[PDB]
Design a protein around this ligand. Structure first.
Ligand SMILES: *[C@@H]1O[C@H](CO)[C@@H](O[C@@H]2O[C@H](CO)[C@@H](O)[C@H](O)[C@H]2NC(C)=O)[C@H](O)[C@H]1NC(C)=O
Lengths: 123, 118, 104
């Protein structure tokens, strides 16, 4: 199971944000998938998902999807939205993953170079 | 930070003034530069009097500076004040560029009066 | 208000720290490690032998000095290198920095 945060393009009209609990690379089929939120499962009515689509490239394998329309602020405040997958090809048969704003944001850092500008402040 | 002196000192023109600033009595502070500098909106102390002898050209005869290592002190005497002397100053030691120093404010005002009725 | 984690007066390093107690929100504060170095680009590599090259590299394994070849003349403890004088030869002392080697 993977997970991609909503497209920044969506986060410019500031109504809704969509999240893609991509599921793939597995066999057999009949994967159920559910979305946790701090231990609280959402309703299946909150989100939508596919059926196991036969995978083109990986031959004897299936894949599916699911989405959920989190609104702008409703993603902008934390709320990691764990996505949990139920299948039979796992040791404990289950897995779950999650995301937030700050899944990336990797080390933004403003260097600064200064000369010839006496600011009247120590260093 | 380890330098210590009076924050603001006021006097009026024509008078003398004497300022004392303190340093820990260690060996170097008993045997190294003391200075009185004046800053502004231009970025830098301009030195006005030094413990090494140099006196600013505008302060010749006006003022001098003496060090009493036994008191852990150095003293600055200014006489013949004017309203052109009011501004922000600093006592300090060592190289002016660092801050082993202490900031002083100075406000000079004219000698009022002229009113025999009060 | 800061907390000087290290103040190495023979590297002129000074790692302080200060929790920026935020706007009075809950505990979404971030602690903050200020650093500061004043590298000389004037001195030797043998700080106490002015017959060596100057310096190019200035390496700060902060791990090492978060606790001896360090390269600023510390102000308070002073240095010297015995130096020959000739008036005849004599092998005699010096005082490589003043105003701190004063036996007083
Ligand atoms: C290079 O530095 C080392 C240590 O930093 C110096 O070693 C000793 O320094 C003391 C200083 O008083 C002298 O009394 C010793 O005679 C030095 N020992 C040796 C073996 O030299 C060393 O002197 C420095 N280099 C030079 C050329 O002096």
């Amino acid at each position: 199971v993977y997970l991609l945060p909503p497209a920044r393009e969506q986060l410019n009209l500031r109504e809704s944000a969509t999240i893609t609990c991509l599921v793939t690379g597995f066999s057999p089929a009949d994967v159920f998938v559910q979305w946790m939120q701090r231990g609280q499962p959402l309703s299946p009515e909150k989100y939508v998902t596919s059926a196991p689509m036969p995978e083109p490239q990986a031959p004897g394998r299936y894949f599916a999807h699911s989405i959920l329309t989190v609104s702008e602020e409703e993603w902008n405040t934390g709320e990691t939205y764990t996505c949990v997958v139920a299948h039979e090809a796992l040791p404990n048969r289950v897995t779950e993953r999650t995301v937030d704003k700050s899944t990336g944001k990797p080390t933004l850092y403003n260097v600064s170079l200064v000369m010839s500008d006496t600011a009247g402040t120590c260093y | 930070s380890p330098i210590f002196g009076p924050e603001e000192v006021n006097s009026v023109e024509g008078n003398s003034v004497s300022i004392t600033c303190y340093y820990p009595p260690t060996s170097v502070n008993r045997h190294t530069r003391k200075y009185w500098c004046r800053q502004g909106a231009r970025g830098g102390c301009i030195t006005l009097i030094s413990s090494e002898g140099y006196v600013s050209s505008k302060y010749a005869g006006r003022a001098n500076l003496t060090n009493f290592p036994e008191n852990g002190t150095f003293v600055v005497n200014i006489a013949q004040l004017s309203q052109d002397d009011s501004g922000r100053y600093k006592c300090g030691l060592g190289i002016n560029s660092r801050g082993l120093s202490f900031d002083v404010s100075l406000e000079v005002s004219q000698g009022p009066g002229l009113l025999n009725d009060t | 208000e800061r907390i000087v984690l290290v103040d190495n007066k023979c590297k002129c390093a000074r790692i302080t720290s200060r929790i920026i107690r935020s706007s009075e929100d809950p505990n979404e504060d971030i602690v903050e490690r200020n650093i500061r170095i004043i590298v000389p680009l004037n001195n030797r590599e043998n700080i106490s032998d002015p017959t060596s090259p100057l310096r190019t590299r200035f390496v700060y394994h902060l791990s090492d000095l978060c606790k001896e070849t360090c390269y600023t003349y510390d102000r308070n403890k002073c240095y010297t290198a015995v130096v020959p004088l000739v008036y005849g030869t004599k092998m005699v002392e010096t005082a490589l920095t003043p105003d701190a080697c004063y036996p007083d």
